[PDB]
Amino acid sequence: MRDLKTYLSVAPVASTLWFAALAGLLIEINRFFPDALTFPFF
Amino acid sequence: SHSVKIYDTCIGCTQCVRACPTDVLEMIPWGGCKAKQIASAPRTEDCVGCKRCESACPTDFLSVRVYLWHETTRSMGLAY
Amino acid sequence: INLPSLFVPLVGLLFPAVAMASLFLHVEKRL
Amino acid sequence: VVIFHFSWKMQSDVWGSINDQGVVTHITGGNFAQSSITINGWLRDFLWAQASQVIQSYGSSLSAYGLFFLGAHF
Amino acid sequence: ALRFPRFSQGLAQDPTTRRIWFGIATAHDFESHDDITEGRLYQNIFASHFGQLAIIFLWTSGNLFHVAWQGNFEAWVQDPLHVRPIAHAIWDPHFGQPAVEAFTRGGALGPVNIAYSGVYQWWYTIGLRTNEDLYTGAIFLLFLSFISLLAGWLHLQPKWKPSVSWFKNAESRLNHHLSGLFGVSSLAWAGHLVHVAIPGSRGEYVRWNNFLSVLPHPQGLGPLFTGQWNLYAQNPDSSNHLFSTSQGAGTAILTLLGGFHPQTQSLWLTDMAHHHLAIAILFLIGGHMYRTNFGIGHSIKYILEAHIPPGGRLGRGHKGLYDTINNSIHFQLGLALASLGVITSLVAQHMYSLPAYAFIAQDFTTQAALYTHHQYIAGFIMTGAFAHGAIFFIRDYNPEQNADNVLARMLEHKEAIISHLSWASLFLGFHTLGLYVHNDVMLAFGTPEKQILIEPIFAQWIQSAHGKTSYGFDVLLSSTNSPALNAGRSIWLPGWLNAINENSNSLFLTIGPGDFLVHHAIALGLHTTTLILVKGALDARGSKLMPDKKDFGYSFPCDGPGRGGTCDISAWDAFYLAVFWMLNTIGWVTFYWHWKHITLWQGNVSQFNESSTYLMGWLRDYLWLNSSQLINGYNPFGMNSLSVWAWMFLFGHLVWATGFMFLISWRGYWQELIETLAWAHERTPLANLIRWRDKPVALSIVQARLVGLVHFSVGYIFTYAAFLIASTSGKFG
Amino acid sequence: LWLSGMYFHGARFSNYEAWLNDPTHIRPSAQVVWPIVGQEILNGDVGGGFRGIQITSGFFQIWRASGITSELQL
Amino acid sequence: GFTPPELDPNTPSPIFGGSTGGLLRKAQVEEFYVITWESPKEQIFEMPTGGAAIMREGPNLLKLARKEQCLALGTRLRSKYKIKYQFYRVFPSGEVQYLHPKDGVYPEKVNPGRQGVGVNFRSIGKNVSPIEVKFTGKQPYDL
């Protein structure tokens, strides 16, 4: 179980998870604020 | 015939002589190292220039060096 | 009497012929 | 070369549309017999003439192929 | 010796075919020949220069003779806009009858070639009118070729060969080359323009048999000495003038107008005469700087040694560079090639925007051909300028004699130079390719309004500062009361503002997002080619992976597979890699130029402005769209005069691809194959009665790289030339 | 697992039944895309009241030669 | 000081079927090589040119076309088998030349009757720059 926690922190798995989460975040941002060319706030 | 030179940083490990495929190199007695040994290159008219000796030397930088020079029949490795 | 009718052939056919036999005989000659 | 030969030959002399009267119109006009024998006919009548579909797919549902064409060249 | 080649004894004792190959490719590297001195090297180079001069004169002799003999000039002078100039005749016995009919144009009586060098416009502009002028010139060039050869011979015997320290007198040579070679020549050219060509474009035919009896100005040489030069510009050609006629002709010989000639869309002749006179004056005065036999002037070495900033930020400054430059020929050659390359692409950029020749701006194919020719030659010259820097660093550089000056300091922080070049080129590549791909995706999904289209507001501002009024910036020369527009309004500003604000010339074309993106691609190319060449130069004396590289020469295959492997580690190999990037960069540049101009010549500028912002646009609307006529040059239904280009197009595609072989396959495979073949031959009957004299061997490693690269770039040039000429000549518009 | 995916996509995101009704007019399609950044343009009119990506693996032909007539079997 | 052996012809050769990898014209006009060894018994071994041969019990004498062939065969014979070998270079004149091992000992073992050839007494980082040897035919490593 500890060995599993180590394995999950090996480079390919760590990067896979990091980028899947990042992808979900950017996807949802663009689903909420679509077609942005400028910063329309201030 | 290529040129092969031995420099005084040699530690006399003999790894270069074991590697030569044409028997160019040789060990000779010395007094400048713990092994009392040094490499020499008495038969450079048979050297094909493979640098198999340089891949084997452990010193930094190298103690055996191969300078490619004028080509002959033996140097090119021609069987015809 | 047509001028290219003579120069195009010999510069195209015989000049390289003589020059190639020339340079072959020269380059394979041991002095 | 094998797949280019098969693709041009099938369109030129096999595939096409037939009419009720029974006159077969092939996808390409049947130009394999006379244009395949030179290299210029392969460059002109096969590559240049049939790449039109993929270089005109931007804006349609075939635009993914137009993107992959260029990505694969890259 | 006792064999070819004589200069190398090591190659002459080579019993394989290598001996021949390398014999040819080492013939002009004089420093590597057996028993070479300093005097022999210098004298060889001097005679070689003379040989090259003879070559150039014989080539231009050939062009003149051939258009005077098989040419079209006389009919072309009568109507420059409605006749195609002939280059020479075709005699080819493999021709069939339809091709014979197809190539017979321009009014000739048989198959011919149309010229695209632009020599009819140039010779017409400077004065030559009938075939006897061209014959005259050709004979004179033959004479000068022979004289060049004679001098080359004369300066190789004893009794006439100069010493090494004659060749090392730098102040002398610079005085003479500045005031003599550049100033006197420009003065005599101003003379030819004032005496022959300015009259030639006003109806009169001044020649050798009458020129001592024709005034160039109404009051010859009066004004010059009384001081009032202004009288020479008192009556210019009116702006309704017809070039080779008297209708609308003036009398001025020197002016400063700025605009173009209205009829020919070309520079005024009086402007060019006045320009050459002005710069000849500048050169003559400036050629009196350095010191010689007369006890005044400057010592270059003293100027170099006195330029060291206190505070020691440049170390020992320039102390000792006179002898580093004076003693190294590769240093001097690198400098020469760098300066010449920059001014070659300056020639390219100025000859299309400010055409000098009459009726050349209306011949589109010659414009495109000249631009591409000069840009590609400039790129090659740049790669050579950088290669001889690495050769200099290996061969002639002396560390102890340059201790702590600017050069050794360059060597001392090579990591900081390479790292920042690397950062710059990474940044440009990432963002340029990223924006292009963004735009392509946006248009594949049908949303061209979602594009990222940055506007080049700085180049638009600089164009406003020159007097363009398309972006409403109202800055210098585009404002109303600024001293810049105020101080020049009388002399050149009328003509300049009239030309720059016209939109059918190429003087400061309008720009938009597409221009921005392609300019950043050009910047990426320049930065990456510089990175490769600079790294190759600064690492040629040794690096960490091979600290003794200087003991191996400029070019060598590798250091074997030890230490991880050392393929392509010489500085020659950095040059070889950089040639690819040079070709790619000049490709981007010339593609940009040709697409912009071909859409402008068709009145369809919006086509470029809309399709240039995504790469599918370039592929479909430029490459694919403009290829139809070329590839239809011959087809199952016949051939037309584009046939020769349709053929050449394919030649270039073939040669190029053959270059891939030598570049992807390497030596061992081929050597084993050849051993097999040698067995086969020696064993077969009636054919083993024949014996080769050199043992056949595969090519060398460096040799294979060179041969591959040569095929690659030959294919490159040939395919692009065929397409460019056929797609402009087919539309002729 | 790859076969499982093919059959599930034929069963769930496909126009196989309508194609079964009129094979020479409906062009087969067993992949649809989400509307995220305008990419829904890739969901093209493949006929039969359906919008997606036309497939070329020839799976409908196999499923018809097999006797499969409902999505429950897939 | 170690007289070298003589070449004893009439020494038999291994049992081979022939192959297209053997001698060629270079052995007729330029040179070829000859290796000899001991072979306690008859055994099979891989020819350094083609397939497999059978070495005979007693002395063995092979003719090859390159020094590298002889030395690769000798390395195989000396490590995988425990066999002593010597090889020679024969000219078209009919002149032999004992080649290896030169002074009776194998070169990876230091023998007290050897001189130094090609030894520089300094590190490799202390060679002069090429500018120091320009126009004179030496090389920077020559020293």
Ligand code: CLA
């Ligand atoms: C470098 C300049 C140059 C070039 C590129 C050409 C090119 C050409 N010439 Mg031309 N020629 C030239 C100079 C040149 N010529 C000069 C100065 C003269 C005398 C005024 C002639 C007289 C001439 C005639 C009479 C004919 C040609 C013909 C031809 C064409 C057929 C090919 C041929 O037969 O070769 C050229 C054949 C010759 C006899 C030329 C001989 C004279 C030159 C000076 C030879 C130079 C060789 C030199 C030793 C090597 C220089 C090194 C470098 C060029 C590689 C060809 C396009 C033929 C043609 O019109 O085809 C339709 C034709 O019959 N030429």
Ligand code: CLA
């Ligand atoms: C289309 C072909 C191509 C491309 C794209 C490149 C690209 C590059 N070359 Mg190169 N080169 C090429 C052909 C090419 N070369 C050829 C034929 C030769 C002759 C052998 C050379 C020889 C050469 C040399 C000698 C050098 C370069 C250098 C460079 C780098 C320059 C820096 C830069 O522009 O930043 C980046 C630009 C890019 C275009 C990178 C594009 C890739 C992006 C990052 C894709 C992103 C991945 C994405 C997330 C999806 C990944 C998919 C997944 C499955 C992994 C760059 C990566 C120089 C260098 O290293 O600079 C430091 C250098 O020294 N090239």
Ligand code: CLA
């Ligand atoms: C006034 C005296 C004088 C003059 C006129 C020259 C002239 C020349 N010398 Mg010399 N020299 C001199 C004194 C002089 N030298 C002295 C005193 C010394 C001893 C210190 C030397 C030592 C010396 C050496 C060692 C060498 C020369 C060389 C040369 C030649 C250079 C190559 C060349 O022709 O390119 C032509 C250059 C120009 C025409 C000017 C440059 C033009 C620029 C780059 C651009 C032109 C712009 C314009 C748009 C072009 C129009 C294009 C259109 C027509 C198509 C040249 C003819 C070289 C040589 O002789 O080769 C055999 C060389 O090796 N000189």
Ligand code: CLA
């Ligand atoms: C005034 C310009 C100039 C001069 C005087 C020199 C002079 C010299 N260069 Mg240099 N160089 C230059 C410009 C110049 N270069 C440029 C512009 C480049 C960039 C391309 C280079 C790049 C360069 C490199 C990388 C090297 C030199 C080398 C040398 C030295 C020996 C060259 C030699 O004889 O090898 C022999 C000459 C050849 C092998 C040329 C034959 C092969 C060519 C490339 C094929 C031509 C293409 C084809 C035939 C034409 C098309 C085919 C047809 C279908 C149309 C020599 C001192 C070499 C050297 O020895 O180091 C000092 C060296 O390695 N140069």
Ligand code: CLA
């Ligand atoms: C278009 C590029 C190109 C071309 C033309 C070739 C051509 C060839 N390859 Mg190669 N190859 C290439 C790309 C190319 N390759 C690339 C990119 C790679 C890297 C993977 C390889 C890797 C490779 C390998 C590993 C091998 C070959 C082999 C061969 C040879 C095959 C034998 C043969 O067919 O003889 C016939 C020759 C031709 C078909 C060429 C065209 C013939 C022309 C049209 C005849 C014209 C003659 C003309 C009149 C000459 C006179 C002109 C005068 C001015 C002198 C052949 C010469 C194989 C080989 O050597 O076989 C023994 C070999 O094993 N190639």
Ligand SMILES: CCCCCCCCCCCCCCCC(=O)OC[C@H](COP(=O)(O)OC[C@@H](O)CO)OC(=O)CCCCCCCCCCCCCCC
């Ligand atoms: C219009 C004619 C074009 C040629 C003009 C150039 C010649 C004028 C300058 C030459 C200086 C000679 C220097 C001494 C050089 C000299 O004469 O030394 C004689 C030479 C002996 O060589 P060396 O022992 O002197 O070698 C020392 C070298 O380092 C000197 O380069 O013997 C030969 O002649 C070999 C002949 C091979 C010929 C190969 C054929 C090459 C074909 C092309 C040759 C040029 C033609 C170009 C046309 C495209």
Ligand SMILES: CC1=C(/C=C/C(C)=C/C=C/C(C)=C/C=C/C=C(C)/C=C/C=C(C)/C=C/C2=C(C)CCCC2(C)C)C(C)(C)CCC1
């Ligand atoms: C490696 C090496 C080498 C080589 C180098 C090179 C090749 C360099 C280059 C470079 C380059 C290629 C450069 C360029 C440049 C440029 C510049 C520097 C410029 C400028 C200018 C200006 C500043 C301008 C101004 C103006 C005017 C006048 C008016 C109008 C406006 C303006 C502003 C535009 C040598 C041999 C030396 C040495 C060894 C090492």
Ligand code: SF4
């Ligand atoms: S390069 Fe090869 S043949 Fe030459 S001495 Fe070294 S190991 Fe022996």
Ligand code: SF4
């Ligand atoms: S490998 Fe290097 S250190 Fe060892 S004996 Fe050979 S030369 Fe000396």
Ligand SMILES: [Ca+2]
């Ligand atoms: Ca304008």
